[PDB]
Each structure stands twice: as structure tokens, then as C-alpha cells.
Amino acid sequence: APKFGDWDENNPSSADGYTHIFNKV
């Protein structure tokens, strides 16, 4: 199985690597 985190390869939807802020649900 892939290493942790390595399931996300060649994915155009990959998240960017910094803190993001969202409205509470």
C-alpha cells in the first residue's frame, strides 16, 4: 500500500499546503 499521504498523486484536486480558513458549519 502507499505510504501515508501518498494516496494523493497526480490529483488536480490536491489541497494546497498552508492554513485555510472557513466559515463554521
Add this chain to the structure above:
Amino acid sequence: FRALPGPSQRQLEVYDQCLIGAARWPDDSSKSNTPENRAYCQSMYNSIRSAGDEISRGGITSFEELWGRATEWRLSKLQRGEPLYSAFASERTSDTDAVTPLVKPYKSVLARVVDHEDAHDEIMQDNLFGDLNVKVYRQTAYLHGNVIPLNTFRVATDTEYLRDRVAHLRTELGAKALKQHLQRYNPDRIDHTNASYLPIIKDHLNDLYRQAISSDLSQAELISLIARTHWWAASAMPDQRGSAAKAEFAARAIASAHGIELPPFRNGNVSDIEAMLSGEEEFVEKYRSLLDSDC
């Protein structure tokens, strides 16, 4: 208030000045060797000492004011027109959640969560991937007799399912809708301290700061108070961007006000992440070991 000695006249070597404020990830310390990062770090070093001068004279009277000086410094390093300026300038508001996905440059954190002595096995129930086994580190604090949940790290362990499932989801919803989900709900992520706790934590940081600018502490007591201040500020993550840099700036400025010239964090030790992965007393006890005090 009694004047403090102020920054040491014996300074770190330039090589070390140029590592103050560096994020020396164990899987990629290449960035710490670039000219722009060395200049950023040396600038942080000098600005820390300028703030320590002022602390030592009674010119910075609260932690909030010191944090503002750290923020002014951090903003000054952004390029003209940087679209992230507002985020680096702003506290997090209680109507929002904050999330950092554990993607690059944070990949070294994945094993730290999975292998953590205090990790828990949980089932995360996600509307797209379904039920996922996760390793979870639940950082907490205790203040005034009450628990405060801080940062929560999650790492999903069924990686073959994730690769296959994420491929699936992308085509149906469009890379747009999957990216929206992953920015907030990436299977590997940090969900940060609820911003609703910032008023109480800010008050505590002001109390720690007032304690830490006293002229009667031993060096051991001072270093512990600096470590504690760093832990609370980094773990609270008060601002939308830049909190780690600001917390390190503040901790070092307090040290410098007392004539302490703290060295860079060791290669592989990213201080805010070390803080978020620890309880308070654990962090205080390990703080010296995180600093590169070798000759």
C-alpha cells in the same frame, strides 16, 4: 518595572542568525540554504533584538503589543501587492474554523502522528470517502482548572482505498468540487484550535508575558516561561497566517530582553509543529533539546 539587560552583546554567528525563524523540515531543509530564506531569517533575528531592546526598557507592555510588533515585521517581508497580506495581518475570528492539510511541506508530520505515543485509533466519518481509520493526536491544554481542546491531527491509514476512491470522486464532482472538499476535509489534516478560545488564551499569554519580563527570575525559570509562552502562542495559532513565525519572534524577543541569545531550532525541529504535537509540560521540558546549543 525594572530595566532588563537587553540583547546580548555577544551575538550568534551569522550562519546561525540566518537560521532564526527557519522551518527546517527533516525531509527538505533545502529552503533553509537559499539566499532569500537566509535574508528573511537574519532580518527576523535583527528585528527580534530590536524588540528585545524595547521590552528591556519597558516600551512593550503587553503580549498583545509584542505580537503586534512580530506581525508588523512579518508583514514587512511580504512582496508588494501580496494577496495574502490581509490574512497575515488578521486574527482568526470566532465565526471560522482553520485547517492545514498535511500535504507538502508537512509530509514529515504524517509519521509523527501515526507513531505518536499519545495517538488514538478513531473512525472518521467523511461524506465522500465513507468511514476511515485514522490515527489521531488530540492536543489539549488545561487552564484555570478546565480542559481546552487545541489542535487535532488526523492521518488516514487505508491508503490504497484512498487512492482508488479519490480517483473515483474526481470525475463525478469535477476537480473543483473535490478540491473544495480536500481543502477543508483532506484525509490527513490539522484542525486547529477553535478561535472561540482566543480571548481566554490571549489573556493567559498577557499573564505569562508579565511574569516573563520580571527581573527576579533564574535563567532556568525564564527559559521555562519562554517555552510556555511559545507553546501557548504557537498552539493557539491566533492569526489566519503567520502565527508560527510570530510566536517564535515573540519567544525570542522575550529571551533577548534578558540578554539570552537563543540559538536556532535544530535541523528537523519545526517549533510550532513540535508545540502542537505536545502537551504543555512535555514541551517545556523538551524545549532546550529542540534548540541547537551545540558548539
